[PDB]
Amino acid sequence: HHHHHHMVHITLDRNTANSWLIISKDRRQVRMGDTHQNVSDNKERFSNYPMVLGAQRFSSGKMYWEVDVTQKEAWDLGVCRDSVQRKGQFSLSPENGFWTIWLWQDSYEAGTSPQTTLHIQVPPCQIGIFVDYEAGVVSFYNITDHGSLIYTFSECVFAGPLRPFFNVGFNYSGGNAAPLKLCPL
Ligand SMILES: CCc1nnc(NC(=O)[C@H]2CCCO2)s1
């Protein structure tokens, strides 16, 4: 792909984080803690899952960023509406305001309803995410495999400002402690 020149500097929004997440000082890395991280509750925090939003809001234009997923067993990545549900149980779908892919149990899937199987021969260590607001497109790229396409959501109905979306996943297995990291431009 040739989307690199739309690169944006994403930072994580602490206030949106599930209370178990640990965000680095530079707001560019996040991981699952082994306990509640001693923050107050608020209406923005994702309560049921290890999720956090980027601080940036997008309502026009083309945007690109990269995320490091090295040695994780489970994660979700993409974008979502600013007004997605924060509390209780919900599925990641465009109907609920999410445009995401994930790794789960050694398979990759796109968060359509129902979910779509992805075909990845080279397990990615870094994922590229491209958003074209005007066109209604969200695309995912395998940076480990020379930028190969993973998935395109087209005919997207954003219906609001978008925010970068992250889920570090649970660590029930003891094999999923590694962080998500925003990669430098
Ligand atoms: C999302 C809030 C919670 N997350 N933390 C909780 N429990 C856990 O995840 C424990 C058991 C597996 C590893 O740590 S409740």
From Swiss-Prot:
Shown chain mapped onto the complete sequence: 291 to 468 of 470
PTM text: Autoubiquitinated; does not lead to its proteasomal degradation. Deubiquitinated by USP4; leading to its stabilization. Autoubiquitinated.
Organism: Mus musculus
Family membership noted in the UniProt record: Belongs to the TRIM/RBCC family.
Signal peptide extent: none
GO biological process: negative regulation of innate immune response; negative regulation of NF-kappaB transcription factor activity; negative regulation of protein deubiquitination; positive regulation of autophagy; positive regulation of cell cycle; positive regulation of protein binding; protein autoubiquitination; protein destabilization
UniProt name for this protein: E3 ubiquitin-protein ligase TRIM21
GO CC term, one of those recorded: autophagosome
Entry's localization field: Cytoplasm; Cytoplasmic vesicle, Autophagosome; Nucleus; Cytoplasm, P-body
Subunit structure: Homotrimer. Component of a SCF(SKP2)-like complex containing CUL1, SKP1, TRIM21 and SKP2. Interacts with CALR, CUL1, FBXW11, HSPA5, IKBKB, IRF3, SKP1 and VCP. Interacts with SKP2; the interaction with SKP2 does not depend on an intact F-box domain. Interacts (via N-terminus and C-terminus) with DCP2 (via N-terminus and C-terminus). Interacts (via C-terminus) with IRF8 (via C-terminus). Interacts with ULK1, BECN1 and with ATG8 family members, including GABARAP, GABARAPL1, GABARAPL2 and MAP1LC3C/LC3C. Interacts with TRIM21 and SQSTM1/sequestosome 1. Interacts with IRF3.
